[PDB]
Write a protein that binds this ligand. Structure first.
Ligand SMILES: [Mg+2]
Lengths: 362, 364
């Protein structure tokens, strides 16, 4: 019986090819915390999670403390086979900090897979190796946005995630410009990230229907907590409505299902606190006839790999996984081939297929 | 026109006189972060918040980074009178971490009051200087529990918060012992810290009604997110039901009001992220005809003083403010007179009156 006898953490910063700007921040790098779990048979397993403070409230410094001083005492000396119980015991000691939980859950899955000499994708039941991602377009003036999208199409992406919600007038005018520069072979996914009110959302949808556009989803149009507005928009809309920030965990999923507040849930491991909780959401959604997609934070290729592994195992084909496009290929080329827009897992990896050698050891 | 020109912090660790055990956890100490804001006229203002990771998710290390690296750039160089906009812009950059926000909000209030040469309680509009607190009692076996309550009664406490929810069979058996040992001049408040399920909560309330006990409240019997069960319990119970972990902020308050999920809200500054958000909750609760009490984490006397100042200004008279009873008197005696069970603000203090720089070394 294998027991976890050591836990290490390491901060990893990855430079971005271009400046990444959000509603609250501008940055040139990804902040991640990595965790290493060591079994008493020598096998090591790894998980890596982002510190996206504005979204999940995680900080590198908080995650490090939580894992070292709170999770570690519960985990150390425990049997690997008891992982579900161990994780439940550990996570109940910490409210929020879902990214810290993600790191730990991933490292456990890496161990489980390595103990069976298979990939995590295989452990989770995946057979297919490949998933299509959209390309993500930051907010901007109409002109530069049209150009960004054109660059995306020229790069072979046919699904375009267009961020909205910063400037409603801009969002409205964009639709005319889209209808004029693009055909139905381009699929649009809008994410307002909470930036619209109820009336604005309805209007934006109405505006869409005035044109000829292929629009797959409207994502998180209103505040994460306004579930009534989400339900009303879902009912009103002829386009699938996606809950993202409205759903972190399984109990959030239960609420949006009960209140009929979306057609589809955007699962992100950094919100769920890893694979176990993400599986619970997918199960609830399946039973409710609610679809799931996967998404991510601006995060390391390791996080992308874990997310793709989960999605392949769960028959989730809709993915917003673009951060691979923001970093140097040699970071992920050992486990992933990105032939846009296809994210393809490499053959025969044990566990996830990445190691921390450069960061931990060299 | 005063500008904030520096922001510094210090960790505070306080030992407890006895072990604090709830359904959620057990501890012998308080970890807090203090923050100091310095105005360009040399006036300094202070806030202190607990790191209760199992409840708010805050950690000293996370709070430290958020305050110094995230909030600070927004705050530094800004005019004190711009505090509302500045806090709104800063807090938008951080999901959760409500205790970090509490520390900053309190420091701002300390400055606002000091600049007017008054106390924070005066600034907020308080008339009264005194509020009565219960004393709270750790989970434990019946005999130990009875002894702890007896200690509290001998200390002049007549309102007794009994922690439950760790062991349901123990909780049921305890009711018999309370009925045997105490009169109706002792008022009980039960707090399960989410530890019971729906069936158990109904059974406990039924059990209470088999005895002769003065029972004032049943607090957070079930999981913070099971609002349906909270509503069912609220509708079932003849005893007021208090939402604690179910309500952090104003939008949480809106939900439990809308769903009739409690009769009373337990406001804590460590959940609200400070006084500004707590004021918003009180206002919503008043409009809904819902009562409020104030509460705290097991936290430093500075947070108690801040919370008492708020309660006094808001006409909130029900309080679970006991941490003063768990720590050395000399930690608070500069700013508070605790004549048990009365928390009394001292006269003529400017701002809160914490006096933190005397005992702590602040660093940017
Ligand atoms: Mg989104």
């Amino acid at each position: 019986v294998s027991k976890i006898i050591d836990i290490k953490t390491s901060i990893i910063k990855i430079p971005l090819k271009r400046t990444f700007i959000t509603a609250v921040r501008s940055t040139n790098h990804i902040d991640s915390l990595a965790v290493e779990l060591t079994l008493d048979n020598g096998v090591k397993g790894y998980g890596v999670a982002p510190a996206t403070t504005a979204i999940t409230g995680d900080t590198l410094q908080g995650m490090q403390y939580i894992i070292r001083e709170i999770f570690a005492p519960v985990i150390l000396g425990s049997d690997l086979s008891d992982y579900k119980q161990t994780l439940e015991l550990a996570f109940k000691k910490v409210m929020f900090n879902s990214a810290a939980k993600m790191a730990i859950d991933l490292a456990y899955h890496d161990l489980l897979a390595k103990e069976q000499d298979i990939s995590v994708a295989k452990l989770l039941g995946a057979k297919a190796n490949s998933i299509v991602t959209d390309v993500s377009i930051s907010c901007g003036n109409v002109a530069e946005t049209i150009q960004n999208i054109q660059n995306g199409v020229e790069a072979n992406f046919t699904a375009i995630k267009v961020k909205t919600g910063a400037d409603f007038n801009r969002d409205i005018q964009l639709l005319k410009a889209l209808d004029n520069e693009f055909s139905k072979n381009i699929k649009f996914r809008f994410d307002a990230n909470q930036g619209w009110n109820l009336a604005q959302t309805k209007q934006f949808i109405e505006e869409i229907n005035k044109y000829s556009l292929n629009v797959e989803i409207i994502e998180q149009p209103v505040k994460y907590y306004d579930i009534k507005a989400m339900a009303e928009i879902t009912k009103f809309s002829n386009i699938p409505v996606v809950a993202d920030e409205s759903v972190f965990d399984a109990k959030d999923a239960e609420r949006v299902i009960d209140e009929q507040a979306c057609n589809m849930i955007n699962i992100k491991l950094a919100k769920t606190g890893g694979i176990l909780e993400a599986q619970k959401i997918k199960k609830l959604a399946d039973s409710a006839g609610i679809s799931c997609m996967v998404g991510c934070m601006m995060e390391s290729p390791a996080g992308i790999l874990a997310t793709a592994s989960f999605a392949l195992a769960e028959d989730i084909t809709v993915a917003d996984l673009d951060p691979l496009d923001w970093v140097a290929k040699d970071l992920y080329s050992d486990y992933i081939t990105f032939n846009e827009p296809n994210i393809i897992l490499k053959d025969n990896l044990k566990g996830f297929g990445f190691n921390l050698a450069e960061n931990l050891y060299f």
